[PDB]
Amino acid sequence: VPAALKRLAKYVIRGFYGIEHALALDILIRNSCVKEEDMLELLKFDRKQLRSVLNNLKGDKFIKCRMRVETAADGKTTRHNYYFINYRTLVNVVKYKLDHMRRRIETDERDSTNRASFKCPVCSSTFTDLEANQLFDPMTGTFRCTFCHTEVEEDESAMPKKDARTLLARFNEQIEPIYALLRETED
Amino acid sequence: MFYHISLEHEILLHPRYFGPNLLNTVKQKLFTEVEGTCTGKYGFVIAVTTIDNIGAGVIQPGRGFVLYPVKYKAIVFRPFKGEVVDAVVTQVNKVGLFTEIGPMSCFISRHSIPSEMEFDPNSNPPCYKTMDEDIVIQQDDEIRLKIVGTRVDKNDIFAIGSLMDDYLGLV
Amino acid sequence: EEDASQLIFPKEFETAETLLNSEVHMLLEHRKQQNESAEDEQELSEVFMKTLNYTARFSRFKNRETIASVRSLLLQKKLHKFELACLANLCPETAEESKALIPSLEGRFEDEELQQILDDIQTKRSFQ
Ligand SMILES: [Zn+2]
């Protein structure tokens, strides 16, 4: 278990998950495999609370579980859930969750062009620029709304467009440590 | 672009029009219905060059009308996106410029107009002119515009003209 | 789905024949001639007048023989039917101008040969 893998997992869990998820990860870092029951006692979390976090971790496939069945000393059947970290599968999910944001960022660039600027104040409905000329009434000489017969404005749609632009630069900066860690874990 | 195509139309002939000259009425009724009407698939129809054939008139059960499918050759013009076509300006306004291309009418938004162009309210005839007056666009002039998009509504089609692309506008 | 520049047209606009404005004017004029005959018949719609003026205004050839000669020469050259209408309608003065208007025209023929084709149309064209 290279130290790079351990650090990479820690850096991502504390950034996009609550303290509950991070604490459970530390147990799996100290020991390669730990029983679900043992983890419950150490963390003192609720039975459902621990399962919910584990399900979320299992949902993102950051850790895998294997079931071992054995006969107890008293003869009753025992079903212990053993959890362990799968770095090979974990790294793919981190890349998947990062590329989608990058492609989402790329999508945000195209969304800005197709945003609907025209909107009627009465019915509070926004219409596309191409659709604006459809409602254009030659007699009035200005944009109008057929449902409301009211003037259509376009100044209110300009403000929210600039907000998305600021998120692009900031997203790339805060994500550099994750990208740098990924390059170190390619071996 | 002007295209000579064959179109399928159906004529419902009232029983009063039966008897001698039935086919003449079907042919005559074809011109009235097709002419002056436009559809998105084929666009505006100018006139019927000829009638290829009149199909068998199928009596409509109960209705009493006879449905006559007609194959007729007519010339139509349809605006194609990303195409340059000569246009004639009808009216000039600050909001936008209105141009007519045959039966089709195109509207040019102020945004699509080049930035250097500015509305000339002071002049009696509204027009768009540059600071140096190198190019002037006014009413009733032959200009070239690019069909950004085609929209059809209420059997009417009107497109958007953009002069941003080079080799456009008055020449 | 359909772009004139990309030479992509729907199934309907595949076998359709393209007629020049001068050619279109002749057909419309024939309709006008028939309009005078058979008095009391339906009067031609206003749309007909609009197109007739438009085609006449842009008519690049006022002689029927010249129109046929231009078409015959164009038939020899392996040119698309849609592109032929644009070539004989716009009548670009220079080969470069023709290429810019129609991006698909690039590579169809040599630049030197392309200019010669345009020059031939000018000779047939009648200036008034
Ligand atoms: Zn409204």
Swiss-Prot record, chain A:
Residues 5-95 form the HTH TFE/IIEalpha-type domain. Zn(2+) binds at C120, C123, C145, C148. A zinc finger (C4-type) spans 120-148. It is found in: Nucleus. Coiled coil: none annotated. The modification N6-acetyllysine is found at K58. Recruits TFIIH to the initiation complex and stimulates the RNA polymerase II C-terminal domain kinase and DNA-dependent ATPase activities of TFIIH. Both TFIIH and TFIIE are required for promoter clearance by RNA polymerase. Belongs to the TFIIE alpha subunit family. Tetramer of two alpha and two beta chains. Interacts with TAF6/TAFII80. Interacts with ATF7IP. Interacts with SND1. Part of TBP-based Pol II pre-initiation complex (PIC), in which Pol II core assembles with general transcription factors and other specific initiation factors including GTF2E1, GTF2E2, GTF2F1, GTF2F2, TCEA1, ERCC2, ERCC3, GTF2H2, GTF2H3, GTF2H4, GTF2H5, GTF2A1, GTF2A2, GTF2B and TBP; this large multi-subunit PIC complex mediates DNA unwinding and targets Pol II core to the transcription start site where the first phosphodiester bond forms. This is General transcription factor IIE subunit 1. It comes from Homo sapiens (Human).
